[PDB]
Design a protein around this motif. Structure first.
Motif, PDB file in Angstrom:
ATOM      1  N   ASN A 290     -13.330  -8.559 -58.138  1.00  0.00           N
ATOM      2  CA  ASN A 290     -12.529  -7.452 -58.646  1.00  0.00           C
ATOM      3  C   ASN A 290     -13.313  -6.564 -59.603  1.00  0.00           C
ATOM      4  O   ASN A 290     -12.898  -5.429 -59.858  1.00  0.00           O
ATOM      5  CB  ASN A 290     -11.270  -7.990 -59.330  1.00  0.00           C
TER       6      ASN A 290
ATOM      7  N   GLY B  89     -19.258 -11.808 -48.468  1.00  0.00           N
ATOM      8  CA  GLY B  89     -18.391 -10.683 -48.210  1.00  0.00           C
ATOM      9  C   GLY B  89     -17.217 -10.544 -49.154  1.00  0.00           C
ATOM     10  O   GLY B  89     -16.682  -9.438 -49.292  1.00  0.00           O
TER      11      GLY B  89
ATOM     12  N   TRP C 104     -24.423  -8.192 -53.250  1.00  0.00           N
ATOM     13  CA  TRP C 104     -23.833  -8.989 -54.317  1.00  0.00           C
ATOM     14  C   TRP C 104     -22.459  -9.536 -53.958  1.00  0.00           C
ATOM     15  O   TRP C 104     -22.002 -10.483 -54.608  1.00  0.00           O
ATOM     16  CB  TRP C 104     -23.742  -8.166 -55.604  1.00  0.00           C
ATOM     17  N   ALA C 105     -21.794  -8.972 -52.952  1.00  0.00           N
ATOM     18  CA  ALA C 105     -20.488  -9.467 -52.526  1.00  0.00           C
ATOM     19  C   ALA C 105     -20.658 -10.857 -51.931  1.00  0.00           C
ATOM     20  O   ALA C 105     -21.197 -11.008 -50.830  1.00  0.00           O
ATOM     21  CB  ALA C 105     -19.858  -8.510 -51.520  1.00  0.00           C
TER      22      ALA C 105
ATOM     23  N   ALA D  97     -16.261  -5.217 -59.023  1.00  0.00           N
ATOM     24  CA  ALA D  97     -16.768  -4.099 -58.235  1.00  0.00           C
ATOM     25  C   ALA D  97     -15.679  -3.067 -57.980  1.00  0.00           C
ATOM     26  O   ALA D  97     -15.927  -1.857 -58.049  1.00  0.00           O
ATOM     27  CB  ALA D  97     -17.344  -4.609 -56.917  1.00  0.00           C
TER      28      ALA D  97
ATOM     29  N   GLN E 141     -23.531  -4.200 -49.626  1.00  0.00           N
ATOM     30  CA  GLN E 141     -23.190  -4.802 -50.914  1.00  0.00           C
ATOM     31  C   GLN E 141     -23.637  -6.257 -50.892  1.00  0.00           C
ATOM     32  O   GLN E 141     -22.820  -7.169 -50.707  1.00  0.00           O
ATOM     33  CB  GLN E 141     -21.693  -4.681 -51.202  1.00  0.00           C
TER      34      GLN E 141
ATOM     35  N   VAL F 107     -12.803  -8.952 -48.595  1.00  0.00           N
ATOM     36  CA  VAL F 107     -13.747  -9.891 -48.000  1.00  0.00           C
ATOM     37  C   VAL F 107     -14.463  -9.148 -46.881  1.00  0.00           C
ATOM     38  O   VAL F 107     -13.908  -8.964 -45.791  1.00  0.00           O
ATOM     39  CB  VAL F 107     -13.058 -11.156 -47.477  1.00  0.00           C
ATOM     40  N   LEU F 108     -15.694  -8.725 -47.140  1.00  0.00           N
ATOM     41  CA  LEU F 108     -16.456  -7.993 -46.137  1.00  0.00           C
ATOM     42  C   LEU F 108     -16.778  -8.906 -44.961  1.00  0.00           C
ATOM     43  O   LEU F 108     -17.197 -10.051 -45.167  1.00  0.00           O
ATOM     44  CB  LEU F 108     -17.748  -7.440 -46.737  1.00  0.00           C
TER      45      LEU F 108
ATOM     46  N   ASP G 117     -18.592  -9.125 -63.224  1.00  0.00           N
ATOM     47  CA  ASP G 117     -17.844 -10.300 -62.793  1.00  0.00           C
ATOM     48  C   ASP G 117     -18.193 -11.518 -63.635  1.00  0.00           C
ATOM     49  O   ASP G 117     -17.307 -12.282 -64.029  1.00  0.00           O
ATOM     50  CB  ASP G 117     -18.110 -10.577 -61.312  1.00  0.00           C
TER      51      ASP G 117
ATOM     52  N   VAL H 264     -15.411  -9.600 -52.174  1.00  0.00           N
ATOM     53  CA  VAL H 264     -15.757  -8.659 -53.233  1.00  0.00           C
ATOM     54  C   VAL H 264     -15.055  -9.065 -54.523  1.00  0.00           C
ATOM     55  O   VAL H 264     -13.821  -9.174 -54.548  1.00  0.00           O
ATOM     56  CB  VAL H 264     -15.391  -7.220 -52.840  1.00  0.00           C
TER      57      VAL H 264
END
Lengths: 182, 42
Positions: free
Chosen positions: A12, A8, A4-5, A14, A2, A41-42, A122, A10
């Motif tokens: 809301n 990391g 676009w995150a 998504a 992902q 948070v990736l 977003d 993310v």
């Protein structure tokens, strides 16, 4: 997985889109209510195992929905929760309580894989709720069109109308509200 | 020596796309364990 995150973290949007897809699988294109417990948070290195569990339906066919994420042996921390409601036969679009915003986001890869790209969603929801407040209470999310690229947001008192540039409605949010997230 | 043609540009690309127990999943907060697998004659 992902890109676009942001760092990391993310948005809301998504998570809302993922819930939309899960409801589409369950035949529930409309989200009755979603409250975000904590954002995702990736990790920069590695990945996180994300589960979205939809419980058995109760009244009005509405199904409970929850999100639990864990990084390897991490305890299952709930990120968002709520209920999914069946789509109404006729959704009454709330009047125009906000000036139109033609939100365009570059690099919407896999935007076809969603009804609306998470980055575009977003940006559109930040143009209404506000950049400083992360939108976490999403009510009456009704999806009509898929694959939008440049969106026209007609903000309402608490939700918004997402349409194509041609004016055909794409999505409607009854009430989306932002909360302080740091 | 005159300049050449002015080509309009758009991006184009095409990226490439347990034997018996398969995938083992533990329910969040539960000891129940689910093994999911697909079995064929070959």
């Amino acid at each position: 997985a992902q890109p676009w995150a942001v760092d990391g973290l993310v948005p809301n949007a998504a998570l809302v889109e993922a819930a939309i897809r899960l409801g589409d699988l369950a035949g529930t294109p409309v989200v009755g209510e979603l409250v975000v417990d904590a954002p995702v948070v990736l990790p920069r290195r590695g990945s996180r195992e994300v589960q979205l569990i939809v419980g058995e339906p109760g009244e009005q066919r509405r199904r409970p929905i929850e999100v639990f994420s864990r990084e390897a042996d991490e305890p299952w921390t709930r990120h968002a929760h709520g209920t999914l409601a069946p789509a109404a036969a006729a959704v009454p679009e709330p009047a125009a309580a906000g000036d139109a915003t033609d939100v365009t986001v570059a690099g919407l890869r896999d935007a076809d894989r969603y009804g609306i790209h998470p980055a575009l969603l977003d940006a559109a929801v930040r143009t209404v709720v506000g950049d400083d407040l992360l939108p976490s209470v999403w009510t009456g999310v009704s999806l009509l069109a898929s694959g939008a690229t440049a969106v026209t947001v007609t903000p309402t008192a608490t939700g918004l109308r997402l349409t194509d540039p041609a004016g055909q409605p794409v999505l409607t949010v009854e009430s989306v509200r932002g909360t302080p997230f740091v | 020596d005159l300049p050449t043609y002015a080509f309009e540009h758009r991006h184009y690309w095409l990226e490439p796309a347990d034997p018996l127990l398969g995938t083992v999943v533990s329910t969040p907060g539960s000891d129940r364990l689910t093994a999911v697998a697909q079995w064929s004659r070959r």
